[PDB]
Structures are given as C-alpha cells and as structure tokens.
Design an enzyme around this catalytic site. Structure first.
Site, PDB file in Angstrom:
ATOM      1  N   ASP A 144      20.214 -61.845 140.111  1.00 14.04           N
ATOM      2  CA  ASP A 144      21.256 -61.362 141.063  1.00 14.04           C
ATOM      3  C   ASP A 144      20.874 -60.321 142.112  1.00 14.04           C
ATOM      4  O   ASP A 144      21.284 -59.168 142.018  1.00 14.04           O
ATOM      5  CB  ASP A 144      22.484 -60.852 140.275  1.00 14.04           C
ATOM      6  CG  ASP A 144      23.484 -60.097 141.149  1.00 14.04           C
ATOM      7  OD1 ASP A 144      23.587 -60.400 142.359  1.00 14.04           O
ATOM      8  OD2 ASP A 144      24.166 -59.189 140.619  1.00 14.04           O
ATOM      9  N   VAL A 184      31.432 -68.280 146.414  1.00 10.17           N
ATOM     10  CA  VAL A 184      30.613 -68.941 145.373  1.00 10.17           C
ATOM     11  C   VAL A 184      31.367 -69.924 144.463  1.00 10.17           C
ATOM     12  O   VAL A 184      32.282 -69.529 143.763  1.00 10.17           O
ATOM     13  CB  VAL A 184      29.883 -67.892 144.470  1.00 10.17           C
ATOM     14  CG1 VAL A 184      29.263 -68.561 143.263  1.00 10.17           C
ATOM     15  CG2 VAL A 184      28.817 -67.130 145.268  1.00 10.17           C
ATOM     16  N   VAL A 189      34.445 -68.938 141.571  1.00  9.36           N
ATOM     17  CA  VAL A 189      34.478 -67.913 140.517  1.00  9.36           C
ATOM     18  C   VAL A 189      34.724 -66.480 141.037  1.00  9.36           C
ATOM     19  O   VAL A 189      35.471 -65.706 140.425  1.00  9.36           O
ATOM     20  CB  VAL A 189      33.211 -67.909 139.604  1.00  9.36           C
ATOM     21  CG1 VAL A 189      33.615 -67.559 138.136  1.00  9.36           C
ATOM     22  CG2 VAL A 189      32.444 -69.234 139.677  1.00  9.36           C
ATOM     23  N   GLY A 190      34.094 -66.129 142.155  1.00  6.85           N
ATOM     24  CA  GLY A 190      34.235 -64.794 142.716  1.00  6.85           C
ATOM     25  C   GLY A 190      33.026 -64.342 143.519  1.00  6.85           C
ATOM     26  O   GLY A 190      32.204 -63.556 143.044  1.00  6.85           O
TER      27      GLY A 190
END
Ligand code: BOG
EC number: 2.7.11.24
Length: 321
Positions: free
Chosen positions: A160, A30, A27-28
């Site tokens: 996060d 990961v 995805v970016g």
C-alpha cells in the site's frame, strides 16, 4: 488486441472497463472485480484526477513509472493498466489493476495461533520485500497488518504505497512528531511491532492518540522539551515481556524497536540475522534495477506530461502468467 469495454455506474462514478473484468464492487476510486480471463480476483483502481494541473500531471507520470518498475515476489505488482481512450486526443482517465489476495495479516492474527515457525517465515518475506522497496528509494510509511497480504501458498506481498486510526499503532515515533527528514528505518520500527503481534497475538502499542501512543512506547523502551517534563519510565527487559518468543526473535526485536533511528538495524542487516538462518539466501535477495529520472528535471506543459503518461500506459506489458 483492444478489448471490448462496458460501462457502469458506481458510487456516482461511471467506470468503463474491459469486459474481462466482471462483478465490479467498490470498497473505499477502487473496485474489486473478477478477471474471467485469468480466473483471478483483482482490485481495480480508477485514478482520482490525473492531469488535474501540472504538478499532478507530473506526479501521475512519476508514480505510474515507479509502479510499472515494481517486480519482486514480495511486493504488489501491476497486472494491468488501461484506458478506454482510443487516442491521446481523448485520453483522460487511467485504470490500474492488481490481484486481490484472499487474506491479510490482521484477519490472520485475529483468527489463528501462529508458531515461531510461521512467524520467522512471514517476517523474512516482509524484510525481503522491504529490502527491495528501500533499494528503489521508496519509504513506505503506513506498514500495518491489514496491508500485508498473503495468498494461498503463504506468499506475502507488501501492498500500500503510491496507492491506497489503526495505523498509528505501527508508526515510528519520529513520524508522529513531524520530523521532516526521517529515515527508511521508520519502516523497520513498523516491522518490529507487527512481529511482536505475531509472536503473542496482541497489539504491542494499542494507544489512542499521539502523545498516548507514545506513553505506551516509553513504557517498553524507557525514556531516552515536553519530554524533559515527562515521567521517569525505566526500560523493560524484552524476555520478561515476550513470554515464549524464540530468544532469537527477541534479540532481533531488541534491534528493531530502538528509538534512535540511527541505531535501528536496516532491512538488509536484519535479513542476515541468525533468526533467519533457514531462509537467508543472499543470492536471491535482489534489489531494484536502476531507473532513469531524467524527466525529474524537465519543465513541460500539461499535455506533455499527459502525452508521456499515455505512452506509458500504451507500452505497458503484463506479467507473463
Ligand atoms: C519521545 C521519543 C521520540 C523519538 C526519538 C527519536 C526518533 C528517531 O531518531 C532521530 O530521528 C531523526 C530522523 O529519522 C534522525 O535525523 C535523528 O538523527 C535520529 O536520531
């Protein structure tokens, strides 16, 4: 005990993972996968360059330990950590596994109209989570709707940190003016803006750049240098602003979106606030277990930090079920 691994080419990177993890999709660093064992959707992160040098070998150790330590219902947990390495002599790469949630706060807000009932429940959970991270000496600093995940049962997790501009919108003022020794209540400012978005469906401070994000903030909370040159902005009355919000929602807000980081309510005080009366339960609002930080003052070679990290990975035990 040792799984069968398989290998794969993804974004110029060869990923090697246990065969339980299927359908790997970046995805970016990961990838999202499907864990056939647990029927769970997961995110898998492969670490960028652990043991790069000494300061990274050590940073990888410290942060793996911090992450292993996280065990709270409102904070991302580690499902799994592995390496395809079969010995310390060949240990180089480290992989982290957490579950993938389904929704998050931003996709939710942009689709459905929440009632005050829904809002009180979400924020309670965020604060309960924040109480725990702060108690572990952590300062998240990028709290935003997209990193607040919620699963089917409406259980929310903070995601996060120690891991990985829409963020500037939820940033505390002092974080934009490169304060060096800023406070944990930088995170409470974020909560306040998220909370305001839940109550109304709209972005509170949808500003483009730094100073301009800030012009927008001054226009809510009035003016408290290049500020001794900024226009007079009077303070707005929050009830006249948030048309609908439970007058308890508003009072809590009035205490979160305060400029002076010294006068900003804590995570723990906010949980005790009357807005949370239906959920507030002091004997299930736990804090982090003490951790040992003896290593913090050690001065080892890269293969010592790597030895230790290896032993942390090996010793990791997954959540029971
Ligand atoms: C234009 C307004 C910008 C923000 C004004 C003050 C922001 C927070 O307030 C200040 O932050 C520091 C670090 O957290 C503390 O050391 C100070 O004591 C505190 O008052």
């Amino acid at each position: 005990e040792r799984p069968t691994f398989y290998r794969q080419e993804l974004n110029k990177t060869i990923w090697e993972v246990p065969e339980r993890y299927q359908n790997l999709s970046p995805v970016g660093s990961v990838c999202a996968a499907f864990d056939t064992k647990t029927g769970l959707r997961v995110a898998v992160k492969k670490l960028s360059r652990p043991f790069q040098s000494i300061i990274h070998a050590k940073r990888t150790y410290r942060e793996l330990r911090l992450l292993k330590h996280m065990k709270h219902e409102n904070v991302i947990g580690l499902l799994d950590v592995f390496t395809p390495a079969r010995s310390l002599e060949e240990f180089n790469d480290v992989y982290l596994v957490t579950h993938l949630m389904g929704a998050d706060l931003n996709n939710i807000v942009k689709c459905q109209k929440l009632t005050d009932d829904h809002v009180q429940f979400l924020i309670y959970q965020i604060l309960r989570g924040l109480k725990y991270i702060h108690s572990a000496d952590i300062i998240h600093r990028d709290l935003k709707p997209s990193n607040l995940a919620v699963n089917e049962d409406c259980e929310l997790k903070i995601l996060d940190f120690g891991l990985a501009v829409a963020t500037r919108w939820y940033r505390a003022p002092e974080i934009m003016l490169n304060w060096m020794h800023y406070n944990q209540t930088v995170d409470i400012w974020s909560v306040g803006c998220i909370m305001a978005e839940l109550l109304t469906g709209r972005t509170l401070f949808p500003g483009t750049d730094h100073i301009d994000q800030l012009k927008l903030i001054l226009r809510l909370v009035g003016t408290p240098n290049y500020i001794q040159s900024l226009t007079q902005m009077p303070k707005m009355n929050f009830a006249n602003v948030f048309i609908g919000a439970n007058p308890l929602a508003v009072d809590l807000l009035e205490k979160m979106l305060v400029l002076d980081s010294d006068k900003r309510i804590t995570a723990a005080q906010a949980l005790a606030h009357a807005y949370f009366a239906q959920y507030h339960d002091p004997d299930d609002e736990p804090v982090a277990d003490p951790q040992d930080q003896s290593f913090e003052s050690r001065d080892l070679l890269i293969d010592e930090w790597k030895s230790l990290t290896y032993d942390e990975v090996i010793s990791f035990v997954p959540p029971p079920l």
